[PDB]
């Protein structure tokens, strides 16, 4: 499964800022998933976001709005998974899905087995996903990973998007992986 | 391997008196246990219960024997695998069982490889499963998802079952997950 | 693999003196390695000992030839793969091989590639296999478990082979597991 | 997957003089990358080195080239992939690369995979290989398993290639290896 922006699309899954509170690194996950929504908009990737009854839970952080396409789609839904109706003539045009969001264990993973399920291969950002547990976080990787889902990384998923140096829009997601990514506690202390 | 109330059992290893002062973070598993037998009595799902050496080993607990259905059958063995006769009517009738209780590494073990054999899928609820070693908890799980069995944790678990917010028993499931299930020591400490 | 006392051989890799400065948990892996030798000897489990490079390296710990039946061989060898010819007949007559000893990296990971292509299972015991080095033994589990070899433990090993409580030698090999195995630091330490 | 001198090339990945402040133990690195070219050298295994834009990154840390074999191509490239059409020849006549060099998640990741692609093992010396970010490192080793690449160490590496201590060039390459490969981290703490 090799990613290009002819062959992807980015899937923003319930990002919304009553969340906030509760999630693990969230301030980081939102950091991180806005350079993602940042590289697909400027490849030309189609973006899909939802949003988990935002009657309650509110809409997706304005930050990330900020970075969308014109022309992006926001679907509210109460089922977990993003693969829903009115997100399958996105999927007919792509090969791949970039994921990010909240609840790893809960609508990251869904997603991740419906799309499996269709034949799409999954690229899950955990560096852009997380959980109100660690223990969940850490697990629903394990399940999408045991599943098939590729667990990447968001400078990795950015840079492996454009190939080499020579991409005409390299200089432009360059930008945006200037520092790299603010850590989520992803990496075990070390043994002396 | 997608879990439903329809095609799913609950199997409840060995989680008697007498293992409490052995077993690492037993308090924290039988929270946890006591969640997705809730869970399984709300949404109907089948659950069997054994007890290895009840007269020595003790009787389920308490707690968790207060939350089974009416007539949740509760069966005595000396083989550790909990696949014995007894349980072989229930099993024809599913496809997935959720799994809980202790010799992870022993009776936990056994029972998925039986399981794996008579071609079930397994979902080892690892916030809800352990061992009097911490050593040979942590090795049972890599066994595990090396013989195909899917590593997943209580609240991945009650979602997945009800799929979404709208679904009929959604609200009476929520409320078993209100607080995150306690901490079990499977998330390293982190390096910055 | 279903390991049992009539499909199954112990293999003992290069447990020899001189290594006893050189090696990550060694006392510890020969307390552990032993528990299997008295296991493998008590359930008549057919046992290979070896030794590479004895006049450089020392012979095999005293602790553990103590625990070997009257016969078992032990043979010397300069190359790294316990799969010598005079091993070959014992592999003929087996499906599974229970391994312990040391360089996990090159003599049990050279070793237990051979057997993968014999077309034998193999059983890594973690807890009684290790290197010099921490990186080395780590990384040599990962490789083992990347050929299709079984990362598992000692109790776990011990009590996979009886498979109940009923077992004639249940009693026997239960004294061997009493107290715990030594902790040879191989899980990762958790964050609060 | 069976590496000898005979069926093997080593793989140097843009491991250049700009990268030495960017890169998570670069010092390290080039010590342990300094040893497979040595062990290449000897062994008379076919290496390849590539540099990514040099222009701008300088050229390969002047130890490593010092021990280069007399005859060693170094190609640069500005695609992240050392796959380019001067590898071909080499690629032809190999059954496995082994792989050292930086951006881990990057240059080594793509690399690993198109050689993959081509039916070549690929072996990725986890102590010779390193990113920026620790998460970005630890990530590349997933992805790089779950296509298939075994993860290595450099000791494993250099004894898997002689195969034992009657090698003609044992002596030779155990001078390489007298002292552990410096630690990068890899192994989780399990005690303060």
């Given at each position: 499964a090799?990613?290009?922006?002819?062959?992807?699309?980015?899937?923003v899954?319930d990002?919304?800022?009553?969340?906030?509170?509760?999630?693990?690194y969230?301030?980081?996950?939102?950091?991180?998933?806005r350079?993602?929504?940042?590289?697909?908009?400027?490849?030309?990737?189609?973006?899909?976001?939802?949003?988990?009854?935002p009657?309650?839970?509110?809409?997706t952080?304005?930050?990330?709005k900020?970075?969308?396409?014109?022309?992006?789609?926001?679907?509210?839904?109460?089922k977990?998974?993003?693969?829903?109706?009115?997100?399958?003539?996105?999927?007919?045009?792509?090969?791949?899905?970039?994921?990010?969001?909240?609840?790893?264990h809960?609508?990251?993973?869904?997603?991740?087995?419906?799309?499996?399920?269709?034949?799409?291969?999954?690229?899950?950002?955990?560096?852009?996903?997380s959980?109100?547990?660690?223990?969940?976080?850490?697990?629903?990787?394990?399940?999408?990973?045991?599943?098939?889902?590729?667990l990447?990384?968001?400078?990795?998923?950015?840079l492996?998007?454009?190939?080499?140096?020579?991409?005409?829009?390299?200089?432009?997601?360059?930008?945006?992986?200037?520092?790299?990514?603010?850590?989520?506690?992803?990496?075990?202390?070390?043994?002396l």
């Amino acid at each position: 499964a090799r990613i290009n922006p002819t062959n992807s699309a980015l899937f923003v899954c319930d990002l919304q800022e009553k969340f906030a509170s509760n999630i693990k690194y969230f301030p980081e996950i939102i950091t991180t998933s806005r350079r993602l929504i940042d590289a697909a908009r400027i490849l030309s990737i189609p973006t899909i976001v939802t949003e988990q009854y935002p009657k309650g839970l509110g809409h997706t952080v304005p930050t990330l709005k900020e970075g969308l396409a014109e022309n992006t789609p926001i679907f509210d839904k109460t089922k977990f998974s993003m693969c829903i109706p009115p997100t399958e003539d996105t999927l007919k045009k792509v090969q791949n899905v970039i994921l990010v969001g909240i609840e790893a264990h809960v609508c990251v993973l869904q997603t991740t087995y419906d799309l499996l399920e269709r034949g799409l291969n999954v690229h899950v950002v955990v560096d852009a996903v997380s959980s109100r547990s660690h223990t969940d976080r850490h697990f629903a990787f394990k399940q999408m990973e045991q599943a098939g889902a590729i667990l990447t990384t968001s400078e990795a998923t950015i840079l492996g998007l454009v190939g080499g140096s020579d991409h005409p829009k390299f200089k432009e997601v360059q930008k945006l992986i200037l520092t790299s990514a603010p850590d989520t506690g992803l990496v075990p202390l070390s043994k002396l």
